[PDB]
């Protein structure tokens, strides 16, 4: 009950699905840059912080 001409339609459907998946999964989260997350990297320096203005 499934002719062989109907296969590439199914393949196209699944290609659309997996492409919709990979366009999201291709994205990734980079390194965090919030200073509040890294303030203790500077708090723990071997010298006190110079607020120079």
């Amino acid at each position: 009950d499934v002719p062989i001409e109907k296969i590439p339609e199914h393949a196209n459907v699944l290609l659309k699905k997996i492409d919709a998946c990979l366009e999201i999964l291709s994205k990734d989260i980079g390194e965090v840059t919030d200073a509040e997350a890294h303030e203790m990297y500077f708090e723990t320096s071997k010298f006190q912080i110079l607020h120079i203005y």
Partner: protein, 68 residues
């Protein structure tokens, strides 16, 4: 003294560690990130001076009356 496995933390394969969550859009909340919410007392210092004086004086008054 100790094998390399103990030092590097793995016998054969180094397992991936799940990174720390950040909670974007707000300050980190840790045991060391609490000074953002709780600074040293700075609002009622002069009231502290006054209340210390009055506490000393009232205590001395009632203590002397009790003793006498």
């Amino acid at each position: 003294p100790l094998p390399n496995a103990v030092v590097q933390g793995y016998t054969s394969v180094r397992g991936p560690k799940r990174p720390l969550d950040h909670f974007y859009g707000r300050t980190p909340l840790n045991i060391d990130t609490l000074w953002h919410w709780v600074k040293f007392p700075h609002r009622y210092d002069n009231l502290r001076f006054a209340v210390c004086f009055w506490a000393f004086l009232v205590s001395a008054h009632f203590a002397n009356k009790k003793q006498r």
